[PDB]
Design an enzyme around this catalytic site. Structure first.
Site, PDB file in Angstrom:
ATOM      1  N   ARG A  12     -19.105  -2.203  12.898  1.00 12.32           N
ATOM      2  CA  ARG A  12     -17.829  -1.515  12.790  1.00 12.32           C
ATOM      3  C   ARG A  12     -17.336  -1.441  11.342  1.00 12.32           C
ATOM      4  NH1 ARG A  12     -15.229  -5.058  17.502  1.00 12.32           N
ATOM      5  NH2 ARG A  12     -15.945  -6.567  15.920  1.00 12.32           N
ATOM      6  N   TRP A  47      -4.388  -6.327   9.394  1.00 17.15           N
ATOM      7  CA  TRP A  47      -4.344  -7.682   9.928  1.00 17.15           C
ATOM      8  C   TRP A  47      -3.843  -8.673   8.901  1.00 17.15           C
ATOM      9  CZ3 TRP A  47      -8.276 -10.120  13.753  1.00 17.15           C
ATOM     10  CH2 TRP A  47      -8.250  -9.407  14.957  1.00 17.15           C
ATOM     11  N   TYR A  55      -3.433  -5.313  20.835  1.00 12.71           N
ATOM     12  CA  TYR A  55      -3.872  -5.066  22.212  1.00 12.71           C
ATOM     13  C   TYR A  55      -2.740  -4.612  23.130  1.00 12.71           C
ATOM     14  CZ  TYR A  55      -8.006  -7.875  20.881  1.00 12.71           C
ATOM     15  OH  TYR A  55      -9.118  -8.386  20.249  1.00 12.71           O
ATOM     16  N   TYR A 108      -8.590  -2.831  17.657  1.00 14.23           N
ATOM     17  CA  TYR A 108      -9.432  -2.959  16.471  1.00 14.23           C
ATOM     18  C   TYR A 108     -10.674  -2.067  16.604  1.00 14.23           C
ATOM     19  CZ  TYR A 108     -12.299  -5.151  12.825  1.00 14.23           C
ATOM     20  OH  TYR A 108     -13.104  -5.395  11.739  1.00 14.23           O
ATOM     21  N   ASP A 129      -8.239  -2.344  23.438  1.00 11.17           N
ATOM     22  CA  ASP A 129      -8.743  -3.015  22.226  1.00 11.17           C
ATOM     23  C   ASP A 129      -8.525  -2.174  20.965  1.00 11.17           C
ATOM     24  OD1 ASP A 129     -10.032  -4.634  20.334  1.00 11.17           O
ATOM     25  OD2 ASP A 129     -12.045  -4.203  21.077  1.00 11.17           O
TER      26      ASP A 129
END
Length: 536
Positions: free
Chosen positions: A252, A261, A508, A515, A513
């Site tokens: 990813r 984040w 979330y 990310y 999900d």
């Protein structure tokens, strides 16, 4: 020999972040006015003879506007005073906000402050159903409960049903604030995210707004954004000259999302070095995850796991070429941390985050052994391994590296898995498994958390997901309790852990999900925080 199929979506962003050049005339000018505005706002806080409700709304507004990090001594002093004077004669609005603000800052105010609003069964008097502001503050306050606050168990349900009922007919921007609160409460939100919504969607639209504060807040949010944009540029340049985008196609590409984040964990300027170290760690352990998850063979993963355990550049040659790439990058990264810190004498503390990395990777390997064997462990055994694979012990330890005030005794504390950290890890764990159950199940994963829970207890998927929700609720009560004074370390070192639980909640949201699939949730966040300035 044969690798899987790669159904990962590429970075939404391209290079739109790779080169940002600050306009210094503007920056210097925003900072100039801000210093003037800061003192105006400080004198607002040290002004004598203010009523209680007025003081709390002041602090509340300064906090939601995102500038409270300027007045930590002034805000603490006022709240300390309010805590000790025991003001128990107000309405629901002032009482609920008093309880929330004091709890959020570690002041163990008694929940019996709410007794005067409850009849016999400790149920809230329904005669309060028509006081919208009171209900809104109660709604927010209900989210900072600990295990000692059973008096408040009805609060969320009571306030929610009546805010929903009132919402459609309320004036603006109250209606939008109410509606947004029901979707994302203040306590569990990412600070910059809530701040951005509050400054632009709410405060700026209020009839009563204080012009000095709104101005201060808009300029401060835009000034820090310039800092964040420079940070993201140098991190984007770092990620670029690593070129995992092409040499490790299976992973990813999410270095922006990783920065979001790191920005959630702390956003203030004094944490700029810490922010850059963290995002690099996050993006890199994400590469390792995807290697175990959907690429590397079992024999390969064994060599990788042992090489990491030994942490020796002499060991690269046992790995396949593609694993040599990430293995050196990892060792190089920590070489970089050590030299980044050596000029302050804090090089040694990097060994703590290394040992938490080794622990993450051992447990990736166990997860894969289990998956190969088709083993469904008991919930107890599943958690003993799966808590660390969240990486949250790792990310928390890493967040201390760039913090100049972090000492050894603070790493000693963290390393013993204190309650507040364990709660943050559990929340990440059970929210993940609830969201990724279906998809991971259909990829043949026999040892998903929800599956272990079903098979162990002999309960349906619904009862199992419900049970995982309670572990989350329990953990939030443990987080809030872990913030109460006297704290075992400086509040400064608790906030990142609290902030890590927040990120999970935000990422979330609506049970998906964010990310791995950043378009629906993370994309507007990154835009509001790192692309668009607040219209000044």
């Amino acid at each position: 020999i044969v690798r899987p199929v790669a159904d990962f979506s590429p970075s939404l962003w391209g290079d739109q972040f790779l080169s940002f050049s600050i306009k210094n005339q503007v920056a210097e000018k925003y900072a100039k006015e801000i210093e003037a505005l800061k003192e105006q706002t400080r004198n607002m806080l040290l002004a004598t003879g203010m009523k209680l409700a007025d003081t709390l709304n002041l602090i509340d507004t300064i906090e939601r506007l995102g500038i409270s990090y300027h007045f930590e001594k002034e805000i603490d002093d006022i709240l300390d005073q309010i805590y000790n004077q025991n003001s128990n004669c107000n309405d629901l609005c002032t009482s609920a906000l008093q309880f929330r603000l004091l709890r959020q800052h570690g002041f163990n105010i008694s929940p019996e402050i709410f007794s005067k609003f409850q009849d016999e069964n400790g149920k809230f008097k329904e005669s309060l159903a028509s006081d919208v502001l009171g209900l809104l503050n109660l709604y927010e306050a209900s989210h900072v409960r600990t295990h000692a606050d059973d008096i408040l168990e009805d609060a969320l349900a009571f306030s929610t049903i009546h805010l929903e009922s009132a919402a459609p007919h309320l004036k603006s921007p109250l209606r939008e604030q109410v509606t947004h609160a029901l979707e994302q409460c203040l306590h569990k939100g990412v600070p910059r995210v809530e701040t951005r919504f509050f400054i632009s969607s709410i405060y700026d639209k209020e009839q009563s707004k204080n012009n000095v504060l709104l101005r201060f807040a808009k300029l401060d949010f835009n000034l820090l954004q310039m800092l964040h944009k420079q940070e993201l540029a140098q991190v984007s340049r770092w990620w670029k000259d690593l070129d995992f985008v092409t040499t490790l196609p299976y992973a990813r590409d999410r270095v922006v999302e990783c920065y979001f984040w790191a920005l959630g964990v702390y956003f203030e300027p004094q944490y700029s070095q810490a922010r850059v170290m963290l995002v690099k760690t996050i993006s890199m352990i994400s590469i390792v995850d995807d290697t175990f998850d959907a690429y590397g063979t079992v024999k390969e993963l064994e060599a990788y796991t042992d090489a990491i355990q030994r942490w020796d550049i002499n060991e690269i040659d046992r790995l396949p070429d593609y694993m040599k790439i990430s293995y050196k990058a990892i060792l190089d990264l920590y070489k970089d941390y050590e030299k980044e810190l050596s000029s302050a004498g804090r090089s040694h503390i990097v060994c703590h985050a290394i040992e938490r990395m080794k622990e993450v990777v051992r447990n990736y390997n166990v997860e894969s052994t289990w998956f190969i064997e088709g083993y469904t462990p008991p919930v107890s055994e599943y958690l003993s391994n799966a808590l660390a694979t969240t990486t949250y012990y790792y990310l928390a330890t890493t967040s201390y590296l760039g913090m100049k005030s972090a000492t050894e005794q603070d790493f000693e504390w963290l390393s013993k898995n204190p309650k507040i950290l364990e709660a943050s890890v559990i929340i990440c764990r059970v929210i993940d498994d609830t969201a990724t159950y279906e998809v991971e199940k259909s990829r043949g994963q026999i040892a998903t958390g929800i599956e272990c829970c079903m098979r162990d207890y002999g309960i349906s998927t619904k009862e199992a997901m419900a049970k995982f929700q309670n572990m989350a609720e329990t953990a939030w009560k443990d987080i809030n309790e872990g913030l109460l004074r006297p704290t075992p370390v400086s509040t400064e070192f608790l906030t990142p852990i609290l902030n890590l639980a927040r990120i999970v909640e935000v990422t979330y949201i609506h049970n998906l999900d964010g990310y791995t699939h950043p378009e629906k949730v993370l994309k507007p966040h990154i835009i509001n925080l790192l692309v668009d300035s607040i219209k000044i």
